[PDB]
Structure formats: structure tokens, C-alpha cells
Design an enzyme around this catalytic site. Structure first.
Site, PDB file in Angstrom:
ATOM      1  N   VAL H   5       0.788  -1.040  -0.093  1.00 51.86           N
ATOM      2  CA  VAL H   5      -0.040   0.044   0.004  1.00 51.86           C
ATOM      3  C   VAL H   5       0.999   1.195   0.068  1.00 51.86           C
ATOM      4  O   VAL H   5       2.387   1.152   0.384  1.00 51.86           O
ATOM      5  CB  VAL H   5      -0.847  -0.029   1.396  1.00 51.86           C
ATOM      6  CG1 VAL H   5      -0.233   0.285   2.421  1.00 51.86           C
ATOM      7  CG2 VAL H   5      -2.264   0.611   1.098  1.00 51.86           C
ATOM      8  N   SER H   6       0.315   2.370  -0.276  1.00 52.40           N
ATOM      9  CA  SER H   6       1.100   3.535  -0.384  1.00 52.40           C
ATOM     10  C   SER H   6      -0.133   4.855   0.276  1.00 52.40           C
ATOM     11  O   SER H   6      -1.238   4.790   0.086  1.00 52.40           O
ATOM     12  CB  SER H   6       1.538   4.335  -1.591  1.00 52.40           C
ATOM     13  OG  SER H   6       2.802   5.159  -1.394  1.00 52.40           O
ATOM     14  N   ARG H   7       0.404   5.495   1.507  1.00 50.24           N
ATOM     15  CA  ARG H   7      -0.484   6.439   1.950  1.00 50.24           C
ATOM     16  C   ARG H   7      -0.669   7.699   1.026  1.00 50.24           C
ATOM     17  O   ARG H   7      -1.671   8.338   1.303  1.00 50.24           O
ATOM     18  CB  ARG H   7       0.368   7.055   3.184  1.00 50.24           C
ATOM     19  CG  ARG H   7       0.470   6.070   4.313  1.00 50.24           C
ATOM     20  CD  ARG H   7      -0.949   5.278   4.410  1.00 50.24           C
ATOM     21  NE  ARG H   7      -0.800   4.636   5.696  1.00 50.24           N
ATOM     22  CZ  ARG H   7      -0.497   3.382   6.197  1.00 50.24           C
ATOM     23  NH1 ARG H   7      -0.056   2.810   5.020  1.00 50.24           N
ATOM     24  NH2 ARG H   7      -0.255   2.835   7.369  1.00 50.24           N
ATOM     25  N   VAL H   8       0.046   7.916   0.076  1.00 46.54           N
ATOM     26  CA  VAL H   8      -0.133   9.295  -0.625  1.00 46.54           C
ATOM     27  C   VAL H   8      -1.222   8.925  -1.976  1.00 46.54           C
ATOM     28  O   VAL H   8      -2.420   9.652  -2.112  1.00 46.54           O
ATOM     29  CB  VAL H   8       1.325   9.582  -1.380  1.00 46.54           C
ATOM     30  CG1 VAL H   8       2.114  10.241  -0.332  1.00 46.54           C
ATOM     31  CG2 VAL H   8       2.054   8.575  -2.023  1.00 46.54           C
TER      32      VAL H   8
END
Ligand SMILES: Nc1ncnc2c1ncn2[C@@H]1O[C@H](COP(=O)(O)OP(=O)(O)OP(=O)(O)O)[C@@H](O)[C@H]1O
Ligand SMILES: Nc1ncnc2c1ncn2[C@@H]1O[C@H](COP(=O)(O)OP(=O)(O)O)[C@@H](O)[C@H]1O
Ligand SMILES: [Mg+2]
Ligand SMILES: [Mg+2]
Lengths: 121, 72, 140, 208, 177, 141, 52, 70, 104, 52
Positions: H5-8
Site C-alpha cells: 500500500v502507499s499512503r499518498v
């Protein structure tokens, strides 16, 4: 770490409940459908008594059917007659004759259209 | 075109003729015994012409009233 | 039900329950061994489907809503109304009327006699079986 | 980590000499996550993880092909033809490992016809990774086989492409080259014909 | 000419060449039939084995002394050693006799063989005993049959079959003995 | 699929020899391709912190960086496996302070703490030998 | 530079560097002394230097 | 892909890639949701098979070499 | 595992509990559609064991209906968020309380 | 799953044997005769072996 083996145990435990239920489902079906097979064995007897039984005949055209199953948890049945199809198909077709290959049951239409696709109508 | 019996000259095969006579006997049975008639009368299968070795076609039958007595 | 034990057991329970819940826990135990067959379409030996519909209506006999405990003579009748075969063999769309209809329509004298004797006597189950068959539920 | 790193950093190739070090590492209760094998993994260029379950199949050397790594397995170091048949051998052995419990609880009858080719090929190359050693010839009796590098790359092209789907699985077991599987597939069929060979009678020898 | 002898034990020779030896020889339907036609016997007097069959029911495999079959050229009785016959049957009453007793199945058609070893086989598709037919539906069906005549020849083939079957069934329930 | 941002902390996690260093090396190699192309202030100055690795792996990685030209923009901090435990503990902080020069002066940095799982083992060795009481897997609290 | 050992699973899937560190990971009875003796049998005779 | 996953998400990728990687991210999830039903192989109504030939062509898209960034 | 199906907010519909789930507090029609949704969602969790072995084709249309309804309910518990439009693109939705009881 | 009827002759003699072996493994106890009426039996080892 220790929960992955715990819920994988939950996977295999009720697969052992599924396949034990499925075995008795297939055993009840084999029991009631056994008497229908005993009845239909009678009428095939007057025709080989009259017309005989001539497998190794020389033809120009031949329809070979392979009676397979539909649902595929049977385990070594529909593969075994596709071995016996080509063992019977190739031993009878050396005259340069036409051949139509038919299958009853869609486990054959997944199995015969890749080993005999040119002759599957 | 062809010759033979009355079904055979009408395009009707023997298996369709002898089944049309078969269910027509089953239609006039007594109701304890006619209950066991549409069990062995129902035709439930599907077929597919494989013209290519590649894909199928169609034609599915859900007839519970027997073999089609209409033309074919 | 399979994991809950009582080491005192039936020696400290209601005698009007002890003769009725003795077959309740056996028919619930048969239902746990045939518990995988409930999810099937291809029926089995109507000796196992007899377990499966009776067992699955026996678990609904033990459902209960919160903050409403039941007197003991009303529980032993409602388990008598499921272990003796008075079950909702009607098509089970009509649950909301017929679930509570046993203790509300069967006349209140059979609860007084069952509480005072502590036991379903032979002079009482003949009126329990008489009262259980005249359950009205006439809106359904 | 600093005791092991203090020792392992002294075993290097420098600019004035090379040490080709081969170290055996014991994993303490077949636990590769034990902190002493796990620390050693970062100090090596080529690990050869041996498996207790491969050895119970009888495959020797008991090397896990999906746990042994090397920094040399890079197409700019070993050539792209040797590299591509290594990654294809590891591809079908991983695909056989993904099927390992379907084949257990449902048998091989329910696999696809394109996955039963995956199983039969990977059951062949994991016999074809097996090899007899010149130091194991005392207790196994079979003589050792040194296999050259090009005979391995060409031999493992053939089981991947499908050139040896004819041969049985056990013809690949404990042979050196892809020549020796063909000369063992014959001997497995000379032997089933040798049941009909002759009736051995020992005659007239008591007076010789 | 008989220069090409096919057969079950002759199928094995071509099958031991092109088919592998991994597979045992496939079975044939003759390996399940004890009774044949050209090997004589089965009479030994005045009784002869009668095999009455539908595809769903074996109705008799006993030995009878008279079988009355509804052939397309009329009814005919089969005594102990009848001439070998392949007789196409029309809708009518198959009558089995072992002696004083008689069972009368009404069949819908389908052939009847008498074989050179005296065995006989009746091969029908639907065989109803006459106490399983209610005659009130039969005359309301022939009246529904012999009235509507479509010009399509596939239906008048079906209509002639409906006329011929329901008429012989009406006369089968009025001819009580 | 997993797009990074310019001030973002992104973990590269996996087992041994699954290609974790390779993803981070391909990041540093790619910045040299982009730094010869962008106007002078979108340039990214990489810092590779090699904690606990062997010394020959680091030299095998400098050789890849000077033959790519990525070593013009790269600092490499390497407290290898033979170094003392407080040097591997301090090398992520040493390398971050070198990379914070570019963050604090208007430029853009990219730091890779290769084997941050090996800094915690070096810090555990210091704390267990300073006789601080151990916790989960004998790590400090 | 590669170091060929003559072993099929070693030469193909995890080739050995001629001046590198090589680990043979094993679990008590799986064969990492027979493998290290076969490496002595295969690469030490063909080596020109000194073994230790 | 199911675990990374990536938070951005958006605003931190290429805007051109954001138009084409959106129909990659869910279309690989349609490839993974049916790969746990590839042992029966009945592949009914040509839907759970159609995502197999396109889902396999997207995972081979993302394969790339080493020390060659794009 | 809810989030890996792409369902957001990734709320476990069974593992979530409240003191307000009480018919004396929220009313008996809000309550029974909450317990009715958890019943069909627990029934789907007990059927996915036999679907991966058989295929969800022989369940005889009472458990093919409880799969088809529960699979709609899993998607209908997901919702676009106003704070999540900046990385998914679709604008967020506020659902009223009467509009989710009648919808479920 | 099949039934008691189709059991073999040498497979339903053992069923008729094992059913009465396991009945003859039961025994009344002297300590339980104070509330079950039937008196208890002390069975010697010589009578246990020949009896089985
Ligand atoms: N995209 C790729 N294509 C082909 N090979 C690759 C790729 N990425 C990595 N490799 C190979 O995989 C091996 C392991 O990669 P790498 O060393 O980057 O992983 P690592 O997890 O950092 O290893 P270690 O656990 O030893 O630190 C390397 O030999 C590398 O050559
Ligand atoms: N290449 C091989 N061929 C045949 N047998 C082997 C081979 N390698 C190991 N074995 C068997 O495995 C056992 C373990 O050998 P060894 O290497 O001495 O143990 P360890 O790996 O524990 O040091 C040996 O006794 C031998 O029987
Ligand atoms: Mg690394
Ligand atoms: Mg040793």
C-alpha cells in the site's frame, strides 16, 4: 506466526467434513441409481445376440463417443477413458478414414478438444 | 424424397417415432402409474456443435413433456 | 452445546426438564455430526434429514432475547412442544406468530400443575398433548 | 552478529589474493529462522540450503532449489542462456509447490491438463537435480558423476521444452547427464523384458 | 464372402500393436451376455426363454410356452421352437402364457426377435399392463387425435401413430376375456 | 502500483534474497538519469546507508555506482558487519544527517537504510551490554 | 568469476563464485559434510593453490 | 500487490500514469480474486476466464530486469 | 481482509459491536435489519468453505440466494468518503440513517 | 454408508462375534449392587481367558 497454522487447521478440518459428507452423498446416489443400471442391462442383450459385436471393422466414417462425467470430483474416471478413447481410436482408423469424436459430459469437452481437436464435432 | 415406412418417408426417424408412440401410451395411464411417466419422459440436456475444434454453439433442451412431436 | 459441560449434570435440574431435555441433548448431538450435510442440495437418507430439520428447529427452541428470563415450567413445555414432535412442520414463513404461540395459547393451569408437582405426570402430559394440538394462530 | 561478522569479514578476496571459502552452516533444529543461521545468510555470496524433506524423497544432494541463492545467478555474469533455464527450472518447481496440497487432498486427477504437464515436468527435474557423488560411492555403490556445466544447461533446456516427456520419471533419478537418462530409460525397459529372458539352470558343476 | 473377420477376441490383436500395453483390453458387451442366438439349446421340450424388455424395466426373463405378439401384419403366437423371426411390432397386447395363466401387457411398438436357438426377446419402449390404463382418457385422446389434421407431414406421421395406438388401446380394454 | 512521493517514508520489506536492495539500487540509478535532465533544483541526492552488510557487498555496490555515474550524486555510509555495534547503530543517523543537508537547503534527498533490521540488532547488543533490561526478542523497550 | 563444481543443482541454480563465500545450510543429517567433501573432491584437485 | 500500500496514492505520481495505472490496480485485483478458483477450471460464462488472460498480461507487464530503470 | 477486496471503510461487519445495538434503544426495525444483515453475512462466511471445494452451483437456490444477497451487502457496506476523494477520485457521500435502514 | 445387508459372509460373522465380545466385556460390580439390584461378579483370570 502461530495463528496461521491455527486457522489452516480450521481449513483442513472442515474439508474433512466436506469430503466426508460428499462421500455419503455419492454413496446414496450410487445406491438408488444402481437399480436403474441393472434394468437397462437387459435391453442391450437382444441386440448383441442378434447383430453380434464387431469392434475391429473397416469403415470410411466412424462416430466415436466418449461418455464422461459432468462434475469432476470423480477422480480418475474421465481421464481413463480418454486414454481408452485414443487407444481404441488409433487402433481402428489406419485405413485413411473419416472420424467424428463426440463426448457426453463436459469433462470430455475440456479433455478431448486438446488431444483430438481436428475430429471433435 | 426417401422410401420406407410412414415415419421414414416423413423425415421422422425410428427413434423419434417409437418415442412418440411411447409417451402417447404414458399419457393415458392411471394417476398412480402416470406419476411414474413424466419422470422417464423428461429430456434435460444440452448440445454444442464444435465446427472448429475451438468453440461450441448452443441448442439446450428443457422438455419435461417428452420428445418433440413437431417437425425437426 | 458440545463444549459446555455440567459436572453436577442432571442430578440438580428440574424433573419436568430432566425427562424432556434428555432427548433434547441427544437429538442436538446427532445434529452436530450431520452438521456438514445441512449445506447440501443432494438430500441424504431422510434418516439424516430427519435429524437436520428437527435439529435446526431445536436450536431455534433455545434462542432467547435479552433481559427476559423464562420461568422453568414455561421452558419445559416449550421443549416438550419440540421434542415430542409438535414442531412447526408448517412452512416456516410463519415464525413470529407460532414461536411464542405455545406458551401463550396453552391454558395457564398446566403451568401451575407442572410447577407444583415439578414433573410432567402421566395425568398431565395427556393434557399437555391435548393442549398442544389446539394451538390457534389464526392470523396466519 | 558482531562476533560472526568479525570472523566472516576476514575471509575475503582482496587485491593481493582470493579465498574461496566454503562453510557448512548447521541449522539447529531445522529452524532457518534461528538467529545463528539467519545471521550467516548476509555474509555469503552463494547459499546452498539443504532440506531434510528433499532427502526423505531420496534426492541427494538434498538441495532446496527454491531456497538456495547466489549472487552469480545474474544474466550479465553467467550468460543469458544459462540464466534463463535456471529461472525456468525455478518457475516450474515453484508451480509444483503451489499445487502440493491440491495434489495431497484431491489427487492429481483434478489438475488441469496444462498443470499436469507442470507436475510431471517438475517431478522430472527434481529427480534430475539429483546426482551421485564420488565420495558417496562407498556407501551407495553407484559410481560418482561429474557433470560439466554445458551438459547441465543443455540437459535442463530439454526437460523444460518438452524433449523428454517420453521418458519415465525415475530414469532421471541419480544420473549424471541427459545422455544417462536415455541410457537408463532403455535399461528400465530391457529389465521388464528380462523377466521373459531365460530360465537360469546351474548344471553339472558339482564335479568340476 | 467372409474375408474380414472382426470380433472381440480379434480386436485384441490390433490393439496389442498400436495401443500401449499399459492399458488392459477394453470390455465388449458380448462379455456380459451368457445367452446367444446361434448356439443351440434352451428349448428341451415345450418351454422357451422369453425376455420382455423396456429400456427401464425387465418385465420377464422366465420361460413360457406361448407368446402372442402384435406384429405389423397382425397378431401371431410363438410356440416352443418358432421359426427364426425379426418381427416388427405395432401397438397391441403382448400376451405371455406359461400354462393356464396369462399376463397381458399393452406395448407401444418395438420389435420382437425369435432366435435360431429358440430364445425370444421382446424389445418395446413402453409396456403398460391393461389395469394401469384408464379408458376414459383413451377415447378423449383419440377424439383429440383423429380430429385435428395439420398439413405438415411430420405431424400426420405423428397423427397416424396417435390414431393407430389409441385405437388398438380402445379395443384392448373392450376385449376382456 | 505503489507510487512514492518526494518526502515519503516507504518501507521495502521482504525475506532474504527477494530483491529488496535491487529496488533501492534501481531508485538511485534512476535519479542519475533524471538529474541530467531537470532544471537544477528537482535533482535528487541519494544516500545509501549500508548497515551490517559485508564489506565486499558494499564495494560491489560502489563499483556499480561509479560505472553508472550515480556516485556523483550519492553518498555511501557503510558501517559493515566487522564494525562495532555502536557504529552500525549510529550509521542510519550519520547518513540521515548527511542527507538532511540537502533537505535543509532546498534540495531533495533520498536515503536508503539498507538493513534497518540490522541496526536494531546492533542496538540490542549495546543495550544488553549496558545491562538495560530486555523485552520482546530481547530488544530494548 | 564462476567456479564450476560439477554438481547439477549447484552449477545451474546457485553457481559458485571463484573467490566468494559459500554457505551450505543443513539440519543434522541432510548431507552438508558429504557435499563439502564432494566439493573437496571436485574443486580442490582442480585448484592450483593451497587448501585449508 | 495485495499487500503493498502507499499512503499518498494520488498527487504523488505522474499524472499521465495516474490515468493508466488506475485501470491496472483494480484489474489486477480481479485477477487475484479468481486465481483461488483455478483448480476446477470450468471457467463459466467467459468472465472468470477473460480476466485470466488479461490479468496474466498485466503481471508480465510489471516484470523488469535489474540495474535498468525505466 | 475486507480491505483487500477493495471494500472501504474496511469494517468487519461481524467483529464490530456497539452498546446501541439494542431494540430498546434504536427501535425494532433498525435492529432486525442489522441482525438480518449479520445473519446473511455469517451464513456466507460458512458457505465459502464449501464453495471453494464445489463451486456454488449445486446449493439449490436457497444458498445461492443467500450468497447473492450477502455479496450485494458486502459491496453496499462500502462507501465513498469525502476525505478519500483525493486519492480515489470519486466524491464522498453522506448517507442518512433512514436511508440506510430502508436500503438494507 | 452401504448397509448391513451386503456385508460378506466372513465379514458378518465377525460382526456377530464382535458384538457379543463387547457385551461380554461388561460386568456387574459388587459396589454398584446396593442401588442396581443385580449382584456383582468377581471373575478370575482363568475364567476370563477361556470365556473369551
Ligand atoms: N528485477 C529483477 N530481475 C532479476 N533478478 C533480480 C531482480 N531483482 C533482484 N534480482 C536478483 O535477486 C537476488 C536478490 O536480490 P537482492 O540482493 O537485491 O535482495 P536482498 O533481499 O537485498 O538480498 P539480501 O537478503 O542478501 O540483502 C539478486 O541476486 C538479484 O540479482
Ligand atoms: N550425496 C549423498 N548421497 C547419498 N547419501 C547422502 C548424500 N549426502 C548425505 N547422505 C546421507 O546423509 C547422511 C548425512 O551425512 P553428513 O553430511 O555426514 O551429515 P551432516 O550433514 O549432518 O553433517 C549420510 O550418512 C548419508 O547417508
Ligand atoms: Mg540486500
Ligand atoms: Mg557434518
Amino acid at each position: 506466526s502461530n495463528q496461521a497454522v491455527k486457522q489452516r487447521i480450521r481449513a483442513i478440518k472442515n474439508i474433512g467434513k466436506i469430503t466426508k459428507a460428499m462421500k455419503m452423498v455419492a454413496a446414496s446416489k450410487m445406491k438408488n441409481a444402481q437399480i436403474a443400471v441393472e434394468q437397462s442391462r437387459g435391453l442391450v442383450d437382444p441386440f448383441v445376440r442378434l447383430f453380434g459385436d464387431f469392434p475391429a471393422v473397416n469403415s470410411n466414417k466412424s462416430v466415436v463417443v466418449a461418455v464422461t462425467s459432468d462434475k469432476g470430483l470423480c477422480g480418475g474416471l474421465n481421464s481413463n477413458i480418454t486414454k481408452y478413447t485414443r487407444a481404441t481410436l488409433a487402433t481402428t482408423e489406419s485405413e485413411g478414414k473419416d472420424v467424428v469424436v463426440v463426448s457426453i459430459g463436459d469433462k470430455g469437452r475440456s479433455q478431448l478438444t486438446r488431444i483430438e481437436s481436428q475430429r471433435y464435432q | 424424397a426417401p422410401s420406407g415406412p410412414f415415419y421414414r418417408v416423413a423425415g421422422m426417424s425410428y427413434l423419434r417415432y417409437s418415442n412418440i408412440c411411447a409417451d402417447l401410451l404414458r399419457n393415458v395411464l392411471k394417476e398412480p402409474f402416470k406419476a411414474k411417466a413424466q419422470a422417464r419422459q423428461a429430456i434435460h440436456f444440452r448440445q454444442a456443435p464444435y465446427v472448429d475444434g475451438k468453440a461450441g454453439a448452443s441448442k439446450v433442451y428443457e422438455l419435461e413433456n417428452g420428445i418433440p412431436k413437431t417437425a425437426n | 452445546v458440545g463444549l459446555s459441560v455440567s459436572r453436577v449434570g442432571s442430578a440438580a435440574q428440574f424433573p419436568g426438564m430432566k425427562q424432556v431435555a434428555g432427548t433434547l441433548k441427544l437429538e442436538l448431538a446427532q445434529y452436530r455430526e450431520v452438521a456438514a450435510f445441512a449445506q447440501f442440495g443432494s438430500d441424504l437418507d431422510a434418516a439424516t434429514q430427519y435429524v437436520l430439520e428437527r435439529g435446526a428447529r431445536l436450536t431455534e427452541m433455545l434462542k432467547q432475547k435479552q433481559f427476559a428470563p423464562i420461568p422453568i415450567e414455561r421452558q419445559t413445555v416449550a421443549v416438550y412442544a419440540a421434542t415430542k414432535g409438535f414442531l412447526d412442520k408448517v412452512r416456516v414463513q410463519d415464525i413470529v406468530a407460532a414461536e411464542e404461540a405455545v406458551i401463550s395459547q396453552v391454558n395457564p393451569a398446566v403451568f401451575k400443575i407442572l410447577k407444583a408437582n415439578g414433573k410432567i405426570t402421566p395425568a398431565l402430559d395427556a393434557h399437555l398433548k391435548a393442549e398442544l394440538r389446539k394451538v390457534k394462530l389464526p392470523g396466519a | 552478529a558482531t562476533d560472526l561478522g568479525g570472523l566472516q569479514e576476514r575471509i575475503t578476496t582482496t587485491t593481493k589474493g582470493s579465498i574461496t571459502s566454503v562453510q557448512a552452516v548447521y541449522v539447529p533444529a531445522d529452524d532457518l529462522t534461528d538467529p545463528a543461521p539467519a545471521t550467516t545468510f548476509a555474509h555469503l555470496d552463494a547459499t546452498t540450503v539443504l532440506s531434510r524433506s528433499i532427502a526423505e524423497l531420496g534426492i541427494y544432494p538434498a538441495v532446496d532449489p527454491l531456497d538456495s541463492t547466489s549472487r552469480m545467478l545474474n544474466p550479465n555474469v553467467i550468460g543469458a542462456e544459462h540464466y534463463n533455464v535456471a529461472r525456468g527450472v525455478q518457475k516450474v518447481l515453484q508451480d509444483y509447490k503451489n499445487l502440493q496440497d491440491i495434489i495431497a487432498i484431491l489427487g492429481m486427477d483434478e489438475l488441469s491438463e496444462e498443470d499436469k504437464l507442470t507436475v510431471a515436468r517438475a517431478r522430472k527435474i527434481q529427480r534430475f537435480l539429483s546426482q551421485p557423488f564420488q565420495v558417496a560411492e562407498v556407501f551407495t555403490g553407484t559410481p560418482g558423476k561429474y557433470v560439466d556445466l554445458a551438459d547441465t544447461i543443455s540437459g535442463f533446456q530439454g526437460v523444460l521444452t518438452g524433449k523428454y516427456d517420453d521418458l519415465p520419471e525415475m530414469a532421471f533419478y541419480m544420473v549424471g547427464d541427459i545422455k544417462e537418462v536415455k541410457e537408463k530409460a532403455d535399461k528400465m525397459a530391457k529389465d521388464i523384458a528380462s523377466r521373459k529372458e531365460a530360465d537360469n539352470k546351474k548344471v553339472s558343476e558339482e564335479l568340476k | 464372402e467372409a474375408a474380414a473377420p472382426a470380433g472381440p477376441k480379434e480386436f485384441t490383436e490390433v490393439w496389442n500393436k498400436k495401443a500401449p500395453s499399459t492399458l488392459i483390453v477394453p470390455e465388449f458387451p458380448s462379455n456380459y451376455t451368457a445367452v446367444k442366438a446361434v448356439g443351440e439349446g434352451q428349448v428341451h421340450g415345450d418351454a422357451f426363454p422369453v425376455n420382455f424388455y423396456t429400456p427401464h424395466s425387465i418385465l420377464s426373463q422366465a420361460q413360457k410356452d406361448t407368446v402372442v405378439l402384435p406384429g405389423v401384419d397382425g397378431y401371431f403366437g410363438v410356440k416352443a421352437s418358432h421359426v427364426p423371426t425379426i418381427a416388427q411390432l405395432k401397438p397391441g397386447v403382448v400376451e405371455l402364457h406359461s400354462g393356464a395363466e396369462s399376463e397381458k401387457f399393452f406395448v407401444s411398438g418395438g420389435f420382437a426377435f425369435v432366435h435360431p436357438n429358440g430364445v425370444t426377446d421382446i424389445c418395446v419402449l413402453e409396456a403398460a399392463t391393461l389395469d394401469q390404463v384408464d379408458p376414459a382418457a383413451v377415447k378423449s385422446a383419440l377424439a383429440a387425435a383423429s380430429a385435428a389434421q395439420p398439413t405438415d407431414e411430420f405431424e400426420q406421421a405423428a397423427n397416424r401413430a396417435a390414431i393407430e395406438l389409441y385405437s388398438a388401446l380402445e379395443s384392448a380394454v373392450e376385449a376382456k376375456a | 502500483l505503489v507510487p512514492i512521493g518526494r518526502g515519503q517514508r516507504e518501507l521495502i520489506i521482504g525475506d532474504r534474497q527477494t530483491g529488496k536492495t535491487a529496488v533501492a539500487i534501481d531508485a538511485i540509478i534512476h535519479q542519475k538519469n533524471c538529474n541530467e535532465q531537470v532544471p537544477k533544483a528537482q535533482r535528487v541526492y541519494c544516500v545509501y546507508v549500508a548497515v551490517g552488510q559485508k564489506r565486499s557487498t558494499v564495494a560491489q555496490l560502489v563499483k556499480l555506482f561509479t560505472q553508472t555515474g550515480a556516485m556523483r550524486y550519492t553518498i555511501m555510509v557503510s558501517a559493515t558487519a566487522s564494525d562495532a555495534a555502536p557504529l552500525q547503530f549510529l550509521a542510519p543517523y550519520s547518513g540521515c544527517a548527511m542527507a538532511e543537508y540537502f533537505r535543509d537547503t532546498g534540495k531533495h534527498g533520498l536515503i536508503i537504510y539498507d538493513d534497518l533490521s540490522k541496526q536494531s540488532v546492533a542496538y540490542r547488543q549495546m543495550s544488553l551490554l549496558l545491562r538495560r533490561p530486555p523485552g520482546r526478542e530481547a530488544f530494548p523497550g | 568469476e564462476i567456479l564450476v563444481t560439477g554438481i547439477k543443482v549447484v552449477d545451474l541454480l546457485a553457481p559458485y563464485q571463484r573467490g566468494g563465500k559459500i554457505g551450505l545450510f543443513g539440519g543434522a543429517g541432510v548431507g552438508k559434510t558429504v557435499l563439502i567433501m564432494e566439493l573437496i573432491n571436485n574443486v580442490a584437485k582442480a585448484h592450483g593453490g593451497f587448501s585449508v
